[PDB]
PDB file of C-alpha atoms and ligand atoms in Angstrom:
ATOM      1  CA  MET A 695      88.758 114.145  83.499  1.00  0.00           C
ATOM      2  CA  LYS A 696      88.953 110.489  81.958  1.00  0.00           C
ATOM      3  CA  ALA A 697      89.082 107.234  83.760  1.00  0.00           C
ATOM      4  CA  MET A 698      91.186 103.934  83.465  1.00  0.00           C
ATOM      5  CA  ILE A 699      90.103 100.878  85.368  1.00  0.00           C
ATOM      6  CA  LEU A 700      92.740  97.974  85.443  1.00  0.00           C
ATOM      7  CA  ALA A 701      91.101  94.713  84.353  1.00  0.00           C
ATOM      8  CA  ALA A 702      93.754  92.749  83.176  1.00  0.00           C
ATOM      9  CA  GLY A 703      94.359  90.707  86.387  1.00  0.00           C
ATOM     10  CA  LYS A 704      94.307  86.726  86.138  1.00  0.00           C
ATOM     11  CA  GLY A 705      92.870  86.317  89.583  1.00  0.00           C
ATOM     12  CA  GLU A 706      94.664  83.075  90.223  1.00  0.00           C
ATOM     13  CA  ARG A 707      93.772  83.565  93.747  1.00  0.00           C
ATOM     14  CA  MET A 708      90.033  83.341  93.367  1.00  0.00           C
ATOM     15  CA  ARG A 709      90.059  80.237  91.442  1.00  0.00           C
ATOM     16  CA  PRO A 710      87.806  78.441  90.245  1.00  0.00           C
ATOM     17  CA  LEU A 711      85.705  81.427  90.126  1.00  0.00           C
ATOM     18  CA  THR A 712      88.098  83.013  87.669  1.00  0.00           C
ATOM     19  CA  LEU A 713      88.249  79.819  85.453  1.00  0.00           C
ATOM     20  CA  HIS A 714      85.666  80.817  83.211  1.00  0.00           C
ATOM     21  CA  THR A 715      84.926  84.438  84.728  1.00  0.00           C
ATOM     22  CA  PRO A 716      87.565  87.277  84.646  1.00  0.00           C
ATOM     23  CA  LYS A 717      87.723  88.692  88.153  1.00  0.00           C
ATOM     24  CA  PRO A 718      86.004  92.008  87.308  1.00  0.00           C
ATOM     25  CA  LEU A 719      82.872  90.567  86.208  1.00  0.00           C
ATOM     26  CA  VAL A 720      82.772  88.430  89.330  1.00  0.00           C
ATOM     27  CA  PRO A 721      79.292  89.153  91.324  1.00  0.00           C
ATOM     28  CA  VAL A 722      79.398  90.890  94.358  1.00  0.00           C
ATOM     29  CA  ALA A 723      76.002  91.072  96.091  1.00  0.00           C
ATOM     30  CA  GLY A 724      74.396  90.606  92.776  1.00  0.00           C
ATOM     31  CA  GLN A 725      76.636  92.993  90.744  1.00  0.00           C
ATOM     32  CA  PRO A 726      79.732  92.563  88.915  1.00  0.00           C
ATOM     33  CA  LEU A 727      82.564  94.156  90.336  1.00  0.00           C
ATOM     34  CA  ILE A 728      83.720  96.267  87.659  1.00  0.00           C
ATOM     35  CA  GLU A 729      80.177  97.585  87.590  1.00  0.00           C
ATOM     36  CA  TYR A 730      80.539  99.447  90.714  1.00  0.00           C
ATOM     37  CA  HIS A 731      83.149 101.369  89.429  1.00  0.00           C
ATOM     38  CA  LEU A 732      81.327 102.393  86.110  1.00  0.00           C
ATOM     39  CA  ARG A 733      77.917 103.254  87.836  1.00  0.00           C
ATOM     40  CA  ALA A 734      80.174 105.475  90.534  1.00  0.00           C
ATOM     41  CA  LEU A 735      82.503 106.988  87.638  1.00  0.00           C
ATOM     42  CA  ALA A 736      79.248 108.071  85.741  1.00  0.00           C
ATOM     43  CA  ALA A 737      77.881 109.447  89.017  1.00  0.00           C
ATOM     44  CA  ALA A 738      80.897 111.098  89.373  1.00  0.00           C
ATOM     45  CA  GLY A 739      80.567 112.870  86.233  1.00  0.00           C
ATOM     46  CA  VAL A 740      83.209 110.866  84.083  1.00  0.00           C
ATOM     47  CA  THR A 741      82.019 110.114  80.795  1.00  0.00           C
ATOM     48  CA  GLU A 742      85.153 108.330  79.189  1.00  0.00           C
ATOM     49  CA  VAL A 743      86.736 104.965  80.347  1.00  0.00           C
ATOM     50  CA  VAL A 744      89.390 103.132  79.018  1.00  0.00           C
ATOM     51  CA  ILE A 745      89.492  99.358  80.410  1.00  0.00           C
ATOM     52  CA  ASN A 746      92.763  97.200  79.948  1.00  0.00           C
ATOM     53  CA  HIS A 747      92.578  93.333  79.982  1.00  0.00           C
ATOM     54  CA  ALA A 748      94.183  90.076  79.234  1.00  0.00           C
ATOM     55  CA  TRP A 749      92.686  87.209  80.827  1.00  0.00           C
ATOM     56  CA  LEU A 750      89.549  86.269  79.732  1.00  0.00           C
ATOM     57  CA  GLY A 751      89.392  89.625  78.403  1.00  0.00           C
ATOM     58  CA  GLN A 752      87.137  89.412  75.417  1.00  0.00           C
ATOM     59  CA  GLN A 753      84.367  88.546  77.673  1.00  0.00           C
ATOM     60  CA  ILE A 754      84.529  92.029  79.402  1.00  0.00           C
ATOM     61  CA  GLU A 755      84.176  93.608  76.269  1.00  0.00           C
ATOM     62  CA  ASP A 756      81.260  91.556  75.415  1.00  0.00           C
ATOM     63  CA  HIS A 757      79.537  91.950  78.699  1.00  0.00           C
ATOM     64  CA  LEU A 758      80.245  95.914  78.808  1.00  0.00           C
ATOM     65  CA  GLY A 759      80.091  96.858  75.208  1.00  0.00           C
ATOM     66  CA  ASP A 760      80.640 100.479  74.609  1.00  0.00           C
ATOM     67  CA  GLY A 761      79.208 101.255  77.983  1.00  0.00           C
ATOM     68  CA  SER A 762      76.309 103.188  76.653  1.00  0.00           C
ATOM     69  CA  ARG A 763      73.960 101.491  79.345  1.00  0.00           C
ATOM     70  CA  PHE A 764      75.964 102.877  81.937  1.00  0.00           C
ATOM     71  CA  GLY A 765      76.223 106.709  80.586  1.00  0.00           C
ATOM     72  CA  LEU A 766      79.615 106.112  79.413  1.00  0.00           C
ATOM     73  CA  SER A 767      82.004 106.029  76.366  1.00  0.00           C
ATOM     74  CA  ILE A 768      84.297 103.027  76.981  1.00  0.00           C
ATOM     75  CA  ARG A 769      87.421 102.061  75.206  1.00  0.00           C
ATOM     76  CA  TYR A 770      89.405  99.026  75.571  1.00  0.00           C
ATOM     77  CA  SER A 771      93.219  98.270  75.890  1.00  0.00           C
ATOM     78  CA  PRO A 772      94.024  94.518  74.755  1.00  0.00           C
ATOM     79  CA  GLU A 773      97.110  93.142  76.209  1.00  0.00           C
ATOM     80  CA  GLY A 774      98.646  89.819  74.650  1.00  0.00           C
ATOM     81  CA  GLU A 775     101.325  89.501  76.723  1.00  0.00           C
ATOM     82  CA  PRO A 776     101.423  90.338  80.607  1.00  0.00           C
ATOM     83  CA  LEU A 777     102.365  93.995  81.145  1.00  0.00           C
ATOM     84  CA  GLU A 778     101.846  94.659  84.723  1.00  0.00           C
ATOM     85  CA  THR A 779     100.161  97.477  86.249  1.00  0.00           C
ATOM     86  CA  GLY A 780     102.619 100.270  84.892  1.00  0.00           C
ATOM     87  CA  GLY A 781     103.013  98.656  81.575  1.00  0.00           C
ATOM     88  CA  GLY A 782      99.767  98.321  81.096  1.00  0.00           C
ATOM     89  CA  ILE A 783      98.977 102.136  81.737  1.00  0.00           C
ATOM     90  CA  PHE A 784     101.516 102.792  79.395  1.00  0.00           C
ATOM     91  CA  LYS A 785     100.024 100.843  76.409  1.00  0.00           C
ATOM     92  CA  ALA A 786      96.674 102.711  77.184  1.00  0.00           C
ATOM     93  CA  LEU A 787      98.144 106.256  76.950  1.00  0.00           C
ATOM     94  CA  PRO A 788      97.401 107.032  73.704  1.00  0.00           C
ATOM     95  CA  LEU A 789      93.765 106.381  74.472  1.00  0.00           C
ATOM     96  CA  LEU A 790      93.719 108.361  77.624  1.00  0.00           C
ATOM     97  CA  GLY A 791      95.838 111.431  76.001  1.00  0.00           C
ATOM     98  CA  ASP A 792      98.033 114.087  77.666  1.00  0.00           C
ATOM     99  CA  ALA A 793      95.817 114.972  80.801  1.00  0.00           C
ATOM    100  CA  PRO A 794      95.448 113.759  84.216  1.00  0.00           C
ATOM    101  CA  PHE A 795      93.277 110.981  84.563  1.00  0.00           C
ATOM    102  CA  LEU A 796      91.631 109.013  87.407  1.00  0.00           C
ATOM    103  CA  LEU A 797      93.214 105.411  87.894  1.00  0.00           C
ATOM    104  CA  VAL A 798      91.215 102.582  89.423  1.00  0.00           C
ATOM    105  CA  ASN A 799      92.272  99.011  90.327  1.00  0.00           C
ATOM    106  CA  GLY A 800      89.272  97.136  89.149  1.00  0.00           C
ATOM    107  CA  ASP A 801      89.541  94.577  91.958  1.00  0.00           C
ATOM    108  CA  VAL A 802      88.664  97.060  94.473  1.00  0.00           C
ATOM    109  CA  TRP A 803      85.490  97.576  96.064  1.00  0.00           C
ATOM    110  CA  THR A 804      85.099 100.925  98.072  1.00  0.00           C
ATOM    111  CA  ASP A 805      82.782 103.722  99.084  1.00  0.00           C
ATOM    112  CA  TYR A 806      84.941 106.215  97.969  1.00  0.00           C
ATOM    113  CA  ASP A 807      83.611 109.176  95.951  1.00  0.00           C
ATOM    114  CA  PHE A 808      85.038 109.717  92.756  1.00  0.00           C
ATOM    115  CA  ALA A 809      84.074 113.291  92.299  1.00  0.00           C
ATOM    116  CA  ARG A 810      86.312 114.295  95.355  1.00  0.00           C
ATOM    117  CA  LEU A 811      89.315 114.001  92.734  1.00  0.00           C
ATOM    118  CA  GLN A 812      88.193 116.562  90.787  1.00  0.00           C
ATOM    119  CA  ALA A 813      89.165 119.056  93.268  1.00  0.00           C
ATOM    120  CA  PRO A 814      92.357 120.916  92.774  1.00  0.00           C
ATOM    121  CA  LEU A 815      95.330 118.128  93.075  1.00  0.00           C
ATOM    122  CA  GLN A 816      99.215 117.865  93.981  1.00  0.00           C
ATOM    123  CA  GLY A 817     102.095 116.763  91.723  1.00  0.00           C
ATOM    124  CA  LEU A 818     102.456 113.971  89.057  1.00  0.00           C
ATOM    125  CA  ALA A 819     100.271 111.633  91.276  1.00  0.00           C
ATOM    126  CA  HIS A 820      97.640 111.877  94.012  1.00  0.00           C
ATOM    127  CA  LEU A 821      97.167 108.795  95.954  1.00  0.00           C
ATOM    128  CA  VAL A 822      94.176 107.747  97.899  1.00  0.00           C
ATOM    129  CA  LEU A 823      95.466 105.644 101.067  1.00  0.00           C
ATOM    130  CA  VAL A 824      93.845 103.335 103.395  1.00  0.00           C
ATOM    131  CA  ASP A 825      94.564 101.790 106.709  1.00  0.00           C
ATOM    132  CA  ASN A 826      96.846  98.587 106.102  1.00  0.00           C
ATOM    133  CA  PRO A 827      94.407  95.567 105.770  1.00  0.00           C
ATOM    134  CA  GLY A 828     100.650  94.430 107.600  1.00  0.00           C
ATOM    135  CA  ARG A 829     103.628  96.746 106.787  1.00  0.00           C
ATOM    136  CA  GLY A 830     101.858  99.013 104.600  1.00  0.00           C
ATOM    137  CA  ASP A 831     103.152 100.973 101.524  1.00  0.00           C
ATOM    138  CA  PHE A 832     103.733 104.467 101.925  1.00  0.00           C
ATOM    139  CA  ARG A 833     103.526 107.187 104.626  1.00  0.00           C
ATOM    140  CA  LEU A 834     101.473 110.386 104.480  1.00  0.00           C
ATOM    141  CA  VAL A 835     102.900 113.663 106.079  1.00  0.00           C
ATOM    142  CA  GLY A 836     100.204 116.205 105.417  1.00  0.00           C
ATOM    143  CA  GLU A 837      99.340 115.859 102.060  1.00  0.00           C
ATOM    144  CA  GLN A 838     102.828 114.806 100.845  1.00  0.00           C
ATOM    145  CA  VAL A 839     103.380 110.957 100.314  1.00  0.00           C
ATOM    146  CA  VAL A 840     106.666 109.569 100.971  1.00  0.00           C
ATOM    147  CA  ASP A 841     107.713 105.849 100.932  1.00  0.00           C
ATOM    148  CA  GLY A 842     107.099 103.566 103.733  1.00  0.00           C
ATOM    149  CA  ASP A 843     109.428 102.016 106.256  1.00  0.00           C
ATOM    150  CA  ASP A 844     107.908 102.020 109.968  1.00  0.00           C
ATOM    151  CA  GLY A 845     102.292 104.641 110.746  1.00  0.00           C
ATOM    152  CA  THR A 846     102.321 103.442 107.179  1.00  0.00           C
ATOM    153  CA  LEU A 847      99.472 103.311 104.980  1.00  0.00           C
ATOM    154  CA  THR A 848      98.455 101.176 102.082  1.00  0.00           C
ATOM    155  CA  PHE A 849      97.868 102.098  98.415  1.00  0.00           C
ATOM    156  CA  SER A 850      93.995 101.728  97.694  1.00  0.00           C
ATOM    157  CA  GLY A 851      94.536 101.478  93.759  1.00  0.00           C
ATOM    158  CA  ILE A 852      92.849 104.659  93.666  1.00  0.00           C
ATOM    159  CA  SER A 853      94.577 107.819  92.126  1.00  0.00           C
ATOM    160  CA  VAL A 854      95.022 110.460  89.717  1.00  0.00           C
ATOM    161  CA  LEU A 855      97.732 110.204  87.403  1.00  0.00           C
ATOM    162  CA  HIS A 856      99.737 112.548  85.127  1.00  0.00           C
ATOM    163  CA  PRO A 857     100.687 110.809  81.870  1.00  0.00           C
ATOM    164  CA  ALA A 858     103.822 112.787  82.245  1.00  0.00           C
ATOM    165  CA  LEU A 859     104.663 110.343  85.178  1.00  0.00           C
ATOM    166  CA  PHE A 860     105.525 107.865  82.353  1.00  0.00           C
ATOM    167  CA  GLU A 861     107.735 110.072  80.196  1.00  0.00           C
ATOM    168  CA  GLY A 862     110.937 108.076  79.009  1.00  0.00           C
ATOM    169  CA  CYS A 863     109.112 104.566  79.669  1.00  0.00           C
ATOM    170  CA  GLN A 864     109.544 102.078  77.286  1.00  0.00           C
ATOM    171  CA  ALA A 865     106.781  99.595  76.151  1.00  0.00           C
ATOM    172  CA  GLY A 866     106.753  96.317  77.812  1.00  0.00           C
ATOM    173  CA  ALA A 867     106.092  95.127  81.197  1.00  0.00           C
ATOM    174  CA  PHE A 868     106.782  97.100  84.171  1.00  0.00           C
ATOM    175  CA  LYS A 869     105.196  97.754  88.148  1.00  0.00           C
ATOM    176  CA  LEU A 870     103.663 100.972  88.796  1.00  0.00           C
ATOM    177  CA  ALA A 871     105.048 101.305  92.549  1.00  0.00           C
ATOM    178  CA  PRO A 872     108.535 101.618  91.393  1.00  0.00           C
ATOM    179  CA  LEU A 873     107.511 104.595  89.452  1.00  0.00           C
ATOM    180  CA  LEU A 874     105.397 106.007  92.061  1.00  0.00           C
ATOM    181  CA  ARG A 875     108.357 105.862  94.396  1.00  0.00           C
ATOM    182  CA  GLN A 876     110.463 107.833  92.106  1.00  0.00           C
ATOM    183  CA  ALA A 877     108.133 110.613  91.918  1.00  0.00           C
ATOM    184  CA  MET A 878     107.765 110.462  95.737  1.00  0.00           C
ATOM    185  CA  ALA A 879     111.671 111.164  95.896  1.00  0.00           C
ATOM    186  CA  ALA A 880     111.248 113.872  93.443  1.00  0.00           C
ATOM    187  CA  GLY A 881     108.563 115.466  95.804  1.00  0.00           C
ATOM    188  CA  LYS A 882     105.670 115.094  93.203  1.00  0.00           C
ATOM    189  CA  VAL A 883     103.323 112.746  94.923  1.00  0.00           C
ATOM    190  CA  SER A 884     100.207 113.983  96.962  1.00  0.00           C
ATOM    191  CA  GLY A 885      97.571 112.012  98.599  1.00  0.00           C
ATOM    192  CA  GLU A 886      94.977 111.627 101.435  1.00  0.00           C
ATOM    193  CA  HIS A 887      94.135 109.220 103.907  1.00  0.00           C
ATOM    194  CA  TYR A 888      90.491 107.558 103.100  1.00  0.00           C
ATOM    195  CA  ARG A 889      88.869 106.100 106.624  1.00  0.00           C
ATOM    196  CA  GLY A 890      85.640 104.815 105.028  1.00  0.00           C
ATOM    197  CA  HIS A 891      85.039 101.262 103.517  1.00  0.00           C
ATOM    198  CA  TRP A 892      87.806  99.544 101.117  1.00  0.00           C
ATOM    199  CA  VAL A 893      88.295  95.920 100.312  1.00  0.00           C
ATOM    200  CA  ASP A 894      91.017  94.800  97.711  1.00  0.00           C
ATOM    201  CA  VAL A 895      89.051  91.614  96.494  1.00  0.00           C
ATOM    202  CA  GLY A 896      91.744  89.270  95.439  1.00  0.00           C
ATOM    203  CA  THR A 897      90.406  86.243  97.177  1.00  0.00           C
ATOM    204  CA  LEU A 898      87.221  84.459  98.097  1.00  0.00           C
ATOM    205  CA  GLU A 899      87.742  85.551 101.703  1.00  0.00           C
ATOM    206  CA  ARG A 900      87.900  89.385 100.391  1.00  0.00           C
ATOM    207  CA  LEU A 901      84.716  88.617  98.574  1.00  0.00           C
ATOM    208  CA  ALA A 902      82.814  87.878 101.510  1.00  0.00           C
ATOM    209  CA  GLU A 903      84.047  90.537 103.560  1.00  0.00           C
ATOM    210  CA  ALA A 904      82.980  93.175 100.690  1.00  0.00           C
ATOM    211  CA  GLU A 905      79.639  91.335 100.725  1.00  0.00           C
ATOM    212  CA  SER A 906      79.296  91.950 104.362  1.00  0.00           C
ATOM    213  CA  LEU A 907      80.033  95.533 104.107  1.00  0.00           C
ATOM    214  CA  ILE A 908      78.159  96.363 101.256  1.00  0.00           C
ATOM    215  CA  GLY A 909      75.276  94.858 103.862  1.00  0.00           C
ATOM    216  CA  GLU A 910      75.050  98.434 105.325  1.00  0.00           C
TER     217      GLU A 910
HETATM  218  C1  491 B1412      98.853  99.059  91.421  1.00  0.00           C
HETATM  219  C2  491 B1412      97.826  98.981  92.492  1.00  0.00           C
HETATM  220  O1  491 B1412      96.582  99.431  92.807  1.00  0.00           O
HETATM  221  N1  491 B1412      98.742  98.354  93.749  1.00  0.00           N
HETATM  222  C3  491 B1412      97.995  98.274  95.106  1.00  0.00           C
HETATM  223  C4  491 B1412      96.862  96.903  95.058  1.00  0.00           C
HETATM  224  O2  491 B1412      97.833  95.929  94.616  1.00  0.00           O
HETATM  225  P1  491 B1412      97.013  94.449  94.282  1.00  0.00           P
HETATM  226  O3  491 B1412      96.670  93.760  95.336  1.00  0.00           O
HETATM  227  O4  491 B1412      95.742  94.792  93.196  1.00  0.00           O
HETATM  228  O5  491 B1412      98.146  93.705  93.385  1.00  0.00           O
HETATM  229  O6  491 B1412      96.394  96.787  96.278  1.00  0.00           O
HETATM  230  C5  491 B1412      97.346  96.602  97.557  1.00  0.00           C
HETATM  231  C6  491 B1412      96.541  96.599  98.692  1.00  0.00           C
HETATM  232  O7  491 B1412      95.882  95.298  98.562  1.00  0.00           O
HETATM  233  C7  491 B1412      98.451  97.681  97.246  1.00  0.00           C
HETATM  234  O8  491 B1412      99.373  97.364  98.503  1.00  0.00           O
HETATM  235  C8  491 B1412      99.027  97.841  95.768  1.00  0.00           C
HETATM  236  O9  491 B1412     100.074  99.085  95.950  1.00  0.00           O
HETATM  237  C9  491 B1412     101.203  98.931  95.929  1.00  0.00           C
HETATM  238  C10 491 B1412     101.966 100.194  96.247  1.00  0.00           C
HETATM  239  C11 491 B1412     101.884  97.907  95.015  1.00  0.00           C
HETATM  240  O10 491 B1412     101.309  98.231  93.607  1.00  0.00           O
HETATM  241  O11 491 B1412     102.754  97.330  95.114  1.00  0.00           O
END
């Protein structure tokens, strides 16, 4: 299937790095964060990728271009207003079309093997969950994801989404989580618990951890 990489974040918590460099282009062990995803996606057999952007967006396009160096075809979804994760995905849906797509949070660094998500999957959404880095986000019972409360897990920012998840939505800014929680209540969200390496690189301290973990 196709993949979307979320890359529109302003990365205020990573200043001053993100003053002239958008977060997805920040180097982790010599390589831009987002290029780990592109190489892994290409290795997993993905050939078409959509990348949304806002803050310093044109630098992302200039650096990556059409993606041919990665064996990929990249299309961009520019945002001129903050749309959040849900609104950003919605704006990009015409580029993704009607079929389920892989969704990856650009800020994440992870070992996770994207080719795993090509296996037969469950629901309007299939979420990869990780140990809390914390009250967590969600709970996993067997393969079914439910809302968190008391052994909770954290959403990794890695998932497969069905465009139908967004049926009825209106253009504009809105968050993804509330939509997932609405699908969970309908029993349409499956998931899995990944126990390997995963870091949400939102701060210089997270950058370091990723650096350290990549040292193995
Ligand atoms: C959309 C998404 O990937 N949300 C995840 C992302 O959020 P981020 O830190 O990038 O803002 O990483 C967090 C863990 O660090 C999760 O709790 C987030 O999922 C929760 C459900 C959320 O969106 O509120």
